[PDB]
Design a binder for this molecule. Structure first.
Ligand SMILES: O=c1ccn([C@@H]2O[C@H](COP(=O)(O)OP(=O)(O)O)[C@@H](O)[C@H]2O)c(=O)[nH]1
Ligand SMILES: CCCCCCCCCCCCCC(=O)O
Ligand SMILES: [Cl-]
Ligand SMILES: [Zn+2]
Ligand SMILES: [Zn+2]
Ligand SMILES: [Zn+2]
Ligand SMILES: [Zn+2]
Length: 267
């Protein structure tokens, strides 16, 4: 595929899910070979694994004293559309959460794609790898296409289930929203997070219930969202990725751990 940028400046704004603060996003076109980077208070922060500063309840980036929370959703959309050269200017401390999915980013950017004058240099998984953490497991292996499977095993009604993304099925995952369990809310608030969370941007689930009156868009919506998150974290390899991935109960911390091991092996 050819390198891509946006045809013009695109704007997005709203509350950040963790900070509870209003922020604003300006996506700027860039020339061939620039890569994906964030820009904040005069500082460029590359969308790369070396710049990850926190992974507990979001993927956060930082450099030279400037930090940006919650980059996983904008990065997943850029990965899915193969946008390879852009600057994401952030006025604020967090990416806006919007409805908790990738849909608004996806629809706006999809309409404004500009093919450029270079063949993409893909990060291609060259051999099988497995990373583990206390129950959680991710494996990666060589493939001509990006294929991503998440298997969840949840302690509520969701139980054990599985969803697989393959290339060409981007529309199946960009609408899936971020989710939280009711028993997790106290912890999240107590560590100084979740300040912008509500039923308008978060699916809140109990042992037996869905609090959002709109309910779930899909029966496996949370698992589709986890696939969407992993594709965002994978873009921290610095280029679009070619590989087959299986994740059992993974989250941002394990995703970033796999990315770091893949990077140092050097694919
Ligand atoms: O299939 C799963 C199951 C759990 N989790 C998350 O990972 C954490 C692990 O929780 P666990 O069931 O292991 O019990 P805990 O470690 O919180 O005591 C939970 O907060 C879940 O939000 C997940 O991402 N995928
Ligand atoms: C109805 C208001 C309650 C919302 C408070 C919870 C805040 C949502 C936190 C999002 C969960 C983290 C997801 C993640 O990034 O891995
Ligand atoms: Cl924490
Ligand atoms: Zn090509
Ligand atoms: Zn925590
Ligand atoms: Zn997240
Ligand atoms: Zn997410």
């Amino acid at each position: 595929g050819l390198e891509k940028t946006v045809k013009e400046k695109l704007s997005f704004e709203g509350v950040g899910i963790h900070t509870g603060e209003y922020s604003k996003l300006i996506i700027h076109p860039e020339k061939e070979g620039t890569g994906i980077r964030f820009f904040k208070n005069g500082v460029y922060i590359p969308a790369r694994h070396e710049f990850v500063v926190h992974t507990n309840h979001s993927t956060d980036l930082g450099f030279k004293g400037q930090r940006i929370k919650t980059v996983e959703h904008i990065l997943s959309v850029l990965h899915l559309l193969e946008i390879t050269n852009v600057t994401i200017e952030v006025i604020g401390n967090e990416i806006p959460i919007l409805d908790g999915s990738g849909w608004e980013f996806y629809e706006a950017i999809r309409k404004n794609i500009l093919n450029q004058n270079r063949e993409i240099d893909y990060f291609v998984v060259e051999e099988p790898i497995i990373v583990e953490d206390e129950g959680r497991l991710i494996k990666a292996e060589p493939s001509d296409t990006l294929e991503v499977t998440y298997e969840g095993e949840f302690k509520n009604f969701l139980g054990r289930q599985k969803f697989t993304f393959v290339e060409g099925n981007e529309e199946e995952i960009v609408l899936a929203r971020t989710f939280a369990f009711d028993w997790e809310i106290e912890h999240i608030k107590k560590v100084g997070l979740g300040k912008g969370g509500s039923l308008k941007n978060t699916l809140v689930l109990g042992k037996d219930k869905v609090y959002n009156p709109e309910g779930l868009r899909y029966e496996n919506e949370p698992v589709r969202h986890k696939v969407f998150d992993l594709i965002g974290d994978l873009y921290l390899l610095g280029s679009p990725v070619k590989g087959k991935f299986y994740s059992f109960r993974g989250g941002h911390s394990l995703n970033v751990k796999l990315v770091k091991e893949l990077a140092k092996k050097q694919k």
